[PDB]
Symmetry: C3
Subunit: 155 residues, 3 copies
Amino acid sequence: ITALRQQVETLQGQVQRLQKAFSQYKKVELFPNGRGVGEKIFKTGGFEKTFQDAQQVCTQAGGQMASPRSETENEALSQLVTAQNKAAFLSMTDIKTEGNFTYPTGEPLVYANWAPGEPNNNGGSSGAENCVEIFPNGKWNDKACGELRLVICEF
Amino acid sequence: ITALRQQVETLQGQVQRLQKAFSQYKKVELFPNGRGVGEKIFKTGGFEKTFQDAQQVCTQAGGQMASPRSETENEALSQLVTAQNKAAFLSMTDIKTEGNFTYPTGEPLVYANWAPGEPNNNGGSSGAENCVEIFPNGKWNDKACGELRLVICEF
Amino acid sequence: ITALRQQVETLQGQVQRLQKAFSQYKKVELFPNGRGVGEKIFKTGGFEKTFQDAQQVCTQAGGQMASPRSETENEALSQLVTAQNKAAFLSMTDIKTEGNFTYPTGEPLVYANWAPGEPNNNGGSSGAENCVEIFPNGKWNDKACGELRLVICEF
Ligand SMILES: *[C@@H]1O[C@H](CO)[C@@H](O[C@@H]2O[C@H](CO)[C@@H](O[C@@H]3O[C@H](CO[C@H]4O[C@H](CO)[C@@H](O)[C@H](O)[C@@H]4O[C@@H]4O[C@H](CO)[C@@H](O)[C@H](O)[C@H]4NC(C)=O)[C@@H](O)[C@H](O[C@H]4O[C@H](CO)[C@@H](O)[C@H](O)[C@@H]4O[C@@H]4O[C@H](CO)[C@@H](O)[C@H](O)[C@H]4NC(C)=O)[C@@H]3O)[C@H](O)[C@H]2NC(C)=O)[C@H](O)[C@H]1NC(C)=O
Ligand SMILES: *[C@@H]1O[C@H](CO)[C@@H](O[C@@H]2O[C@H](CO)[C@@H](O[C@@H]3O[C@H](CO[C@H]4O[C@H](CO)[C@@H](O)[C@H](O)[C@@H]4O[C@@H]4O[C@H](CO)[C@@H](O)[C@H](O)[C@H]4NC(C)=O)[C@@H](O)[C@H](O[C@H]4O[C@H](CO)[C@@H](O)[C@H](O)[C@@H]4O[C@@H]4O[C@H](CO)[C@@H](O)[C@H](O)[C@H]4NC(C)=O)[C@@H]3O)[C@H](O)[C@H]2NC(C)=O)[C@H](O)[C@H]1NC(C)=O
Ligand SMILES: *[C@@H]1O[C@H](CO)[C@@H](O[C@@H]2O[C@H](CO)[C@@H](O[C@@H]3O[C@H](CO[C@H]4O[C@H](CO)[C@@H](O)[C@H](O)[C@@H]4O[C@@H]4O[C@H](CO)[C@@H](O)[C@H](O)[C@H]4NC(C)=O)[C@@H](O)[C@H](O[C@H]4O[C@H](CO)[C@@H](O)[C@H](O)[C@@H]4O[C@@H]4O[C@H](CO)[C@@H](O)[C@H](O)[C@H]4NC(C)=O)[C@@H]3O)[C@H](O)[C@H]2NC(C)=O)[C@H](O)[C@H]1NC(C)=O
Ligand SMILES: [Ca+2]
Ligand SMILES: [Ca+2]
Ligand SMILES: [Ca+2]
Ligand SMILES: [Ca+2]
Ligand SMILES: [Ca+2]
Ligand SMILES: [Ca+2]
C-alpha cells in the first residue's frame, strides 16, 4: 500500500540521520577519556581507587574493569593511561591461585603483556601483589590490590 | 509487497543495533559524573557556582537544576556529591515565602530530606539562607544563595 | 498486509523514543565541555597541548581542530575557553604564506575576529607566530605554534 511505503521511506531517513548523529556523538563522547575497540568501550573516570573500590565503581556504572584480550585492546588502555599519566588497575587477579592470573570469570589469560621480571608478587610494605597495573608503555606489573591506581571501566 | 517487507526487516535490524549501541553509550556517558533515574538524568559539571550562576549554566545547557522528587532521585544526587566530595545546590528556594521551599515552578516540595535542625535560615556573614545544599550523606541544609556550591544539572 | 503495518507502527514508536532519548543524551554529553552549532560539535579535552600535538589528538579522536566559520561558531568556542579559563588553539595557520591565515585545507578565512593589533607575528622568545589562539572574549591573537594552549576539537 502507498501509505506504508511512504512511512517506510520516512523511517529510512530518520534512521539514517540517527546513525549519522550517533557516530558523531560516539566520537564526541570518547574524547578524550574513552577508547572503542570492537564492541567494547574503555573509559576512565580520571580518579584513583583500590582494586576492590574500582571493581565496585565499574559494576555500579553498569560495566566492569578492563580485560585486555588482545594487543589492540591493551594499546587502547595504554593511551588512556598515557593521557592521565596514571597507571591503571586491570580486571585480572591471581588471588585464587598464586602466579595464575585469571579474568573475573575464572578464565585464564588469552593475552598478556608482563614487563620484564613480572609478575614477582613483591609489593614491599603492601605485601603480596595479587592485582595488575598497566603502564603508559602498555606493559603490566603485578601490584598490591590495596594500592590506589587509575580506574578504567569496560562497557 | 516483498520489497517493503525486506525494507522493514532491514530497518528492524538497524533499530535493534541502534538500541543496543545506545544503551552502551548511555552508561559510558554517565560514567562517572552522571546518574539516571526514570526519564531524568542528573549530571555534574565538576565545578562550583553561586545559585544564580548555576541556574544560568543549567538553563543554558538545555536543562535545569536538580529537583529530587523521591528518595531514589535524592540518593542519585548523593552519589554525585559523594564522588566530587563537594556539596551541591538544589533547585528549590524559599525566596518567595520564608520557610516555604518550592521548586522553580512555585510547586511545594513533594519530597524533603532536611538534616536535623534545618532549615534554620542562619548563614552568618552571608546572611539569610534561601537556597538548599545537599550533603554526601543525602541530607539537606538551607544555605545562602551567594555561596559557591557544586553544580548538578537535571536533563 | 496487516502484519507489516503493525511492524511499521512499532518501528515508528521505537524511532520516536530513540530520538527523544538521543536529544536528551546530546545535551547531557555536551554539558559542560561541549557546544553544538549546526551539524558541528565543539568539545574541549580540558588539557593544553602544542599546536602539532593538538592536531594529532583531534585527528586521532576522529575529528579536527576548531575552524570557526561564523560568529555563532566563534562564540561557541568563546564559551568553552571562558569556562576552562584557558585560551585555545584554532585550526588556522599562516605557515605557507606569512600574514595569510588559512584552514588546514588551504582555504582562506571566511570569518575572522582578530584582536586590535593582531596578527603581528611577534612571539618574543618563542619566535614567529604562525598559529592562532582564541581569548575568553572571543578575540583572536596569533601565537607561536610551540606554545601550549587549550585543546578544542571539532566533530
Ligand atoms: C590457571 O587456572 C585456570 C583455572 O583453573 C586454568 O584455566 C584452564 O586452562 C585450561 C588449559 O588451557 C583450559 O583448557 C582449555 O579450555 C579451552 C576452552 O574450552 C573449555 O571450555 C569449553 C566450554 O566453555 C569446553 O567445551 C571445552 O571442552 C573446554 O572445557 C574445559 O575442559 C577441561 C578439561 O579438558 C576442564 O578442566 C575445564 O574445566 C573445562 N572448561 C570449561 C569452561 O568447561 C579448550 O579449547 C582447550 O582445548 C584444548 O585441550 C583439549 C583437552 O582439554 C583438547 O581436546 C583440544 O584439542 C585443545 O587442545 C590444545 O590444542 C592445541 C593446538 O590446537 C595444543 O597446542 C594444546 O597443547 C592443546 N591443549 C591441551 C591441554 O591439550 C582446553 O581444554 C580450561 O578451560 C581452563 N579452565 C577454566 C576454568 O577456564 C589454567 O590452566 C591455569 N594456568 C594458567 C597458566 O593459566
Ligand atoms: C508553600 O507555598 C506554596 C505555594 O503557594 C503552597 O503550595 C500549595 O500547597 C497546597 C496544599 O498542599 C496545594 O494544594 C493541593 O494541590 C494539589 C494539586 O492539584 C492542584 O492543582 C491542580 C492543577 O494542577 C488542580 O486541579 C487541583 O485542584 C489543585 O489546585 C489547587 O487548588 C488550591 C485550592 O484548593 C489552590 O490554592 C491552588 O492554587 C491550586 N493549584 C493549582 C496549581 O492550580 C491537590 O491534589 C490537593 O488536593 C487536596 O486538597 C483539595 C482541596 O484543595 C481536596 O479536594 C483534595 O481531596 C486533596 O485533599 C487532601 O487529601 C488528603 C488525603 O488524600 C488529605 O490528607 C489532605 O489533608 C487533603 N488536603 C487538603 C488541603 O484538603 C491540594 O489542593 C497547592 O496546589 C499548592 N499551590 C501551588 C501553587 O502549587 C504551600 O501550601 C505552602 N506551604 C508549604 C508547607 O509547602
Ligand atoms: C591567501 O592564500 C590563499 C590560498 O592561495 C588565497 O585563497 C584564495 O582566495 C581567492 C580570492 O578570494 C579565492 O578565489 C575565490 O574562490 C571562490 C570559491 O570558488 C573557487 O573554487 C571553486 C571550486 O571549489 C571554483 O569553482 C571557483 O571558480 C573558484 O576557483 C578558484 O579560482 C581561482 C582563479 O579564479 C583560482 O586561483 C583558485 O585556485 C580556485 N580555487 C579552487 C579551490 O579551485 C570564488 O567563489 C570566488 O569568485 C570570485 O572571483 C571569481 C574570479 O576568480 C569571479 O568569477 C566571481 O564572480 C567572484 O567575484 C567576486 O564577486 C564579489 C561580489 O559578489 C566581488 O566583491 C569580488 O571582488 C569578486 N572577487 C574577485 C576576485 O573577482 C573567487 O574565485 C580562491 O578560491 C582561494 N584559493 C584557495 C586555494 O582556496 C587568498 O587569496 C590569500 N589571501 C588572503 C587574504 O586570504
Ligand atoms: Ca600474586
Ligand atoms: Ca610486581
Ligand atoms: Ca530562608
Ligand atoms: Ca542552614
Ligand atoms: Ca605568522
Ligand atoms: Ca600575536
